[PDB]
Design a protein around this nucleic acid. Structure first.
Ligand SMILES: [Mg+2]
Ligand SMILES: [Mg+2]
Ligand SMILES: [Mg+2]
Ligand SMILES: [Mg+2]
Ligand SMILES: [Mg+2]
Ligand SMILES: [Mg+2]
Ligand SMILES: [Mg+2]
Ligand SMILES: [Mg+2]
Ligand SMILES: [Mg+2]
Ligand SMILES: [Mg+2]
Ligand SMILES: [Mg+2]
Ligand SMILES: [Mg+2]
Ligand SMILES: [Mg+2]
Ligand SMILES: [Mg+2]
Ligand SMILES: [Mg+2]
Ligand SMILES: [Mg+2]
Ligand SMILES: [Mg+2]
Ligand SMILES: [Mg+2]
Ligand SMILES: [Mg+2]
Lengths: 141, 82, 100, 206, 67, 80, 62, 145, 143
RNA sequence: UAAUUGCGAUAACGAACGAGACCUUAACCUACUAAAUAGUGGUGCUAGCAUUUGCUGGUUAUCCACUUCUUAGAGGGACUAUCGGUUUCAAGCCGAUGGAAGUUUGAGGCAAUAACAGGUCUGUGAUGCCCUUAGACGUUCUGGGCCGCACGCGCGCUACACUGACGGAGCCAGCGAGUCUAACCUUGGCCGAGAGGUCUUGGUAAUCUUGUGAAACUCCGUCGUGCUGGGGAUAGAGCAUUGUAAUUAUUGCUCUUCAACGAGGAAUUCCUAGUAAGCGCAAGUCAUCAGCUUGCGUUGAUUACGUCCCUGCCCUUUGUACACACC
């Protein structure tokens, strides 16, 4: 057996299951490396867990993610949460907390939702209006 | 049938599309002393059209007069090569 | 054999009771089986205007029937098998057994 | 700096932007100190972001919007006037092009230009309405530092939107010349002209 | 508003009146014992009652309280 | 044929049945009994059988061209 | 163009019929420990710093 | 990429099919000012007449022009699949035509006075100046003239 | 080091394969090129027009390599768009079926894609071979 | 206090309904039970590139292991917890910390007493009375009309453009529906520019349609401030589908014609976060027809966190010549 963990990152409806094991350290997004997410502005949003901790920590571990659901923006935030969660959970299972403790305050001081999925969920649409809160229009004369 | 306004017209600018030899060499000396070159730069200046402002912009690349920093479509940003 | 028992009730308490009796029947009949596989609950929504006529504020109303489905795969001779069909019947519980 | 190769080929530019200095796409968040007082810790610098897109939540509390970076606040005001509601990826791309144009012209830091634009065009006095009765009357009041920043972002983005409407100039360059003129002070930007006429009304209605 | 209703307050008052040599200033052990010492139909009500008893233990430990 | 059978059972707690009491109120009114007298007997019978509260409402034309409603009840009933 | 910086030290309350104007008392950084009362259009917090075109003002409720 | 200087043979607005064809803009949209030629027909006519679409119509020599208007007036000879045509199976001869500059409103009037003189519903609807395609006329088309 | 179609960017790969098939020029010409709109929602034909049977063939070649099997029905869903139905609001409409069918029939002729069980078409060894070579060509042109 | 919510005071004590409590739903669970009708990893067979270990795949009777992601059943969790202030210092309130979640956690369902001479006899084989009952106001057939247009209004949809239009590429959801004495949702192959037609297939359904490859979106290109390639009303010719039947065009398609509209006057509506707004999709009615509604997802702002000025609501005091009650 090989040292392997698995995590998931979440968004509105996008889930990204990341398989983190030991190896040379390729990172793949559903078939393809990190440089080909292609919003090309949220591409640098996905580099953010990697660029915060240095690329030396990723030299021993390879991560493969499978992202479904949501849209293009929401899938990006599912990846960047799954990368940080998978990196932490590997350092839970196999190496010391001294990496972990400096990993988590590096994440949480910068951006909180790197490790935790945000609680904002859609509100149901209500009758008498097009949206959750709005109404149609009132007429009197 | 009420306008509820006056709807004043415009000045009817007459930007020419095709260039000529007098307009050809005009962009050669005058592209230097522009600190920033784009399609909108070459239209608010001398009155060539937007399409030739793209074609003559790509023309300046194969020889090299002005330098790139970004090559996004719909916004081409171009500075002077010193 | 590879028969399946599918339960499609709308009351969850009797359906879990019937499912529990079936899986505890095969347990004392020492049979290696597929567990109670739980399908997603079907929510049948019907939205209607509350008003009989068309007067008043446009107030709507969504009635809803929740159907819960569960199936267990079992592998036993027919003399055993016909007796699960004989037992474990509850009100509002639809019990079906198919072969292969 | 140390070049590290890896199974997926990491470019050097994203490597240099990672370890050397935490940047924008190419811009730095240092030496961007705001010279104008009373607006410190209400314009957000020293908190770096790589891109203006962040899924933060600042509408939960009252003064939480002050902690949002001023680049992201500019992109949020850029997506306005109806059909541009949402579409934040266009707002970031417009801002990225705008900061490039603020680099080739007026070669100082584009982050330093926008924070000078915010501070110069922020109205320090304005007028409210008293109970008019027969006729409404204006009364001059002072402006909070939060509202000074909020008015500055709104005035800059409105003037750029009106300038780019129905003309050949794009939204990126019209916003750039609005931010350049507001940082200088010229009474030709729409932001400055609205500020002085608001303070003139406040002066005559004390 | 987090004002507690009289059903929570009186259920807390009856437990304080009756089981002082018992549940303490920790909410977790109070919830784990007020569930069996009182038949409460709702988990939301049980946490509300156990919460207010703990608030009453804190009040009791600093002087007497009325009622 | 043979797939249908019907069983008849005596209903437990005859006083604790709204549908049995509604028909008891229904046939008493068309027999000729007073509306107040028929309701008060039904409301008395429901709590005598071991209920917590009862309420009978009669609506329609009673002794007048104009229609109204009277509500006979005792005990307590929840609504929400 | 003389301007004067003042620091909000205690928020007094809302004023104006529609409630949009806040009564505050402010402490001047220069010429320390002499304080006046002003009116603020926007959201004003403790330790906010105000700049005033003129400091010769008392605040009366609108 | 490359920019030619200018030709002495460039001309402003020109004459085809007794229409005032606007020069100064691109050829595909230049032929669209001719009534009977839209965006699809002008794009296809220029494709079969092997002119480059990038060139402005104000600069074009002779022998391409009457070649272009020949394909216009004789479409089916130059491999037009007859579902591009405006007026196919006409009303009289069953053939496939493509009406043009002074023909489009000509065939418009003669269909109408035929429809008026046959006393069909569409004729008297056009005679009265009302909507004919079944549109509601209670609340629309009020400022009709 | 191992080259796949996933290893290179999508946009420059399709451009490379369309240019390669332009440089070769051997697929098919259906006959009704430069007359068709490629969907019911389009209103005027593709602006390129010296091709686009080769951009479309390149796009479906990568797309077949992506998935297991597609038919003409899945391609019309993919290449459809919002149709401006005049005054009425926009709606998704399907793409034109004859182009995608004749692309696949042309794609079958060379041997770049083959028929499959469970319906549809599927990449094979010779098919993905030509895909993988230019995929290797696609990332050495940066050098 | 959101709350006749509570502290308390007290000629009142003990009560009841409403509020709350309750129920449903969205969040967390790497803790339980499992799951070829959901998946994941490994092992077989096999395709390719590099070949040096590897990468990307395919594979139903190839097995093995597991439930993190996915579905449920049973549960746990949050009670404003801890800390710091403020209040007769009681109910509480404010800030920070931890937490998935600390605006009664979010959104609903239920919802008192008394009423309106509100709406509905055109939902009912629910109805009292009045009318009509064989040239019937019964029912049924045929053809029309409900759409008719000198105009006035209400809810809406497209827009007046470069934060754009168009063409290529890129490429992602969720709610949900579907055939029996019927003929449904349709995959795949073939023909046709298109709409659509034909030969089949799967599915009574977490299995098949369907990963509903949705649209706004991203990236390359063309145009270029011109009522212009903006916008697509009004017309003309033809090709198909539904239906016995489409003529006052049902709808879809192809070509042509290319009107107002240059941001909207007096006025007026909705809205405090995944909300407004932009964008589509499913269902409802349905043989055909969404510019409507009920919901769902995608992208996702600005600006207060207040007040009683306007329009109204609740409680107390007060004056009243008001009682179908300030109309
Ligand atoms: Mg909405
Ligand atoms: Mg403009
Ligand atoms: Mg497309
Ligand atoms: Mg295999
Ligand atoms: Mg609630
Ligand atoms: Mg009725
Ligand atoms: Mg009748
Ligand atoms: Mg009608
Ligand atoms: Mg309405
Ligand atoms: Mg597009
Ligand atoms: Mg889905
Ligand atoms: Mg158009
Ligand atoms: Mg739109
Ligand atoms: Mg429908
Ligand atoms: Mg309707
Ligand atoms: Mg109002
Ligand atoms: Mg008096
Ligand atoms: Mg009186
Ligand atoms: Mg009066």
């Amino acid at each position: 057996a090989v040292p392997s963990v698995q995590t998931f990152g979440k968004k509105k409806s996008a889930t990204a299951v990341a398989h983190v094991k030991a190896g040379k350290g390729l990172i793949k997004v559903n078939g393809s490396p990190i440089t080909l997410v292609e919003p090309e502005i949220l591409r640098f949003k996905v580099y953010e867990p990697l660029l915060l901790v240095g690329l030396d920590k990723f030299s021993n571990i390879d991560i493969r993610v499978r992202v479904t659901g949501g849209g293009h923006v929401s899938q990006v935030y599912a990846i960047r949460q799954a990368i940080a969660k998978g990196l932490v959970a590997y350092h839970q299972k196999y190496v010391d907390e001294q990496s972990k403790n400096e990993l988590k305050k590096a994440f949480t001081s910068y951006d909180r939702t790197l490790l935790i999925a945000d609680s904002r969920r859609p509100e149901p649409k209500k009758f008498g209006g097009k949206g959750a809160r709005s109404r149609f229009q009132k007429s009197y004369r | 049938k009420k306008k509820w306004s006056k709807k004043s017209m415009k000045d009817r600018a007459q930007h020419a599309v095709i260039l000529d030899q007098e307009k050809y060499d005009r962009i050669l000396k005058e592209v230097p002393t522009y600190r920033y070159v784009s399609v909108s730069v070459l239209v608010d200046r001398l009155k060539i059209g937007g399409s030739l402002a793209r074609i003559a912009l790509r023309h300046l690349e194969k020889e090299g007069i002005i330098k790139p920093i970004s090559k996004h479509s719909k916004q081409a940003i171009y500075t002077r090569a010193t | 054999i590879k028969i399946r028992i599918t339960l499609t009730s709308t009351k969850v308490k009797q359906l879990e009771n019937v499912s529990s009796n079936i899986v505890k029947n095969a347990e004392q009949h020492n049979l290696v089986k597929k567990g109670p596989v739980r399908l997603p609950t079907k929510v049948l929504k019907i939205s209607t205007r509350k008003t009989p006529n068309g007067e008043g504020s446009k107030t709507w109303e969504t009635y809803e029937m929740r159907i819960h489905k569960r199936y267990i795969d079992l592998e036993a001779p027919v003399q055993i098998v016909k007796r699960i069909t004989q037992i474990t019947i509850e009100p509002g519980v639809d019990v079906e057994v198919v072969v292969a | 700096f140390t070049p590290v190769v890896l199974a997926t080929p990491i470019p050097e530019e994203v490597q240099q932007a990672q370890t050397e200095i935490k940047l924008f796409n190419k811009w730095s968040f240092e030496e961007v100190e705001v010279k104008d007082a009373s607006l410190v810790d209400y314009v957000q610098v020293r908190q770096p972001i790589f891109v203006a897109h962040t899924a933060g939540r600042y509408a939960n509390k009252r003064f939480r919007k002050a902690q949002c970076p001023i680049i992201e606040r500019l992109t949020n005001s850029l997506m306005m006037n109806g059909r541009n509601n949402g579409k934040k990826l266009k707002a970031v791309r417009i801002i990225k092009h705008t900061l490039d144009i603020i680099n080739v012209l007026t070669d100082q830091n584009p982050i330093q230009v926008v924070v000078d634009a915010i501070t110069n065009t922020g109205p320090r006095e304005d007028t409210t309405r008293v109970g008019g009765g027969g006729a409404a009357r204006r009364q001059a009041v002072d402006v909070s530092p939060l509202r000074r920043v909020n008015q500055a972002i709104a005035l800059l983005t409105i003037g750029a939107r009106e300038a780019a409407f129905r003309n050949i100039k794009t939204i990126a360059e019209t916003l750039a010349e609005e931010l350049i003129n507001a940082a200088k002070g010229s009474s030709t930007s729409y932001a400055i002209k609205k500020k002085d006429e608001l303070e003139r009304v406040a002066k005559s209605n004390r | 508003g987090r004002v507690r209703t009289k059903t929570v307050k009186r259920a807390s008052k009856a437990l304080i009146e009756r089981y002082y040599p018992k549940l303490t200033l920790d909410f977790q052990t109070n919830k784990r014992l007020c569930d069996e010492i009182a038949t409460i139909q709702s988990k939301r009500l049980r946490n509300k009652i156990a919460g207010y008893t703990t608030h009453l233990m804190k009040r009791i430990q600093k002087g007497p309280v009325r009622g | 044929p043979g797939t249908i059978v019907l069983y008849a059972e005596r209903v437990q707690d005859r006083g604790l049945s709204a549908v049995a009491q509604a028909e008891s109120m229904k046939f008493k009114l068309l027999n000729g009994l007073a509306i107040r007298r028929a309701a008060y007997g039904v409301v008395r019978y429901v709590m005598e059988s071991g209920a917590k509260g009862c309420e009978v409402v009669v609506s329609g034309k009673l002794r007048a061209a104009r229609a109204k409603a009277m509500k006979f009840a005792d005990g307590f009933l929840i609504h929400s | 163009t003389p301007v004067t910086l003042a620091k909000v030290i205690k928020v007094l309350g809302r004023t104006g019929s529609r409630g949009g104007v806040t009564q505050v008392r402010v402490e001047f950084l220069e010429d320390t420990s002499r304080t006046i009362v002003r009116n603020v259009k926007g959201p004003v917090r403790e330790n906010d710093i105000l700049v005033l075109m003129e400091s010769e003002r008392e605040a009366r409720r609108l | 990429s490359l920019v030619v200087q200018e030709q002495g043979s460039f001309q402003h607005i020109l004459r085809l099919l007794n229409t005032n064809v606007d020069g100064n803009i691109k050829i595909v949209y230049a032929l669209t000012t001719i009534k009977g030629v839209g965006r699809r027909y002008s794009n296809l006519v220029c494709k079969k007449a092997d002119v480059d679409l990038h060139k402005r119509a104000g600069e074009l020599t002779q022998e391409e022009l009457e070649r272009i208007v020949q394909i216009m007036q004789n479409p089916t000879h130059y491999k037009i699949p007859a579902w591009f045509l405006n007026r196919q199976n006409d009303i009289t001869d069953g053939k496939d035509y493509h009406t043009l500059a002074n023909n489009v409103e000509s065939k418009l009037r003669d269909d109408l006075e035929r429809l008026k003189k046959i006393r069909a519903h569409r004729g008297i609807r056009h005679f009265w100046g009302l909507r004919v395609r079944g549109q509601h006329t209670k609340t629309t088309g009020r400022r009709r003239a | 080091p191992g080259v796949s179609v996933r290893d290179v960017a999508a946009q420059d790969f399709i451009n490379a394969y369309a240019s390669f098939l332009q440089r070769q020029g051997k697929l098919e010409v259906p006959g009704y090129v430069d007359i068709v709109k490629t969907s019911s929602g389009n209103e005027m034909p593709p602006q390129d027009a010296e091709g686009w049977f080769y951009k479309r063939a390149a796009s479906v070649a990568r797309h077949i390599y992506m998935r297991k099997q597609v038919g003409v029905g899945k391609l019309n869903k993919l290449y459809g768009g919002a149709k401006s139905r005049g005054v009425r609001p926009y709606k998704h409409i399907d793409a034109s079926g004859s182009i995608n069918r004749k692309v696949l029939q042309a794609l079958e002729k060379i041997g770049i894609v083959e028929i499959s069980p469970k319906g549809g078409r599927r990449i094979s060894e010779n098919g993905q071979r030509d895909l993988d070579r230019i995929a290797a060509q696609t990332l050495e042109e940066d050098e």
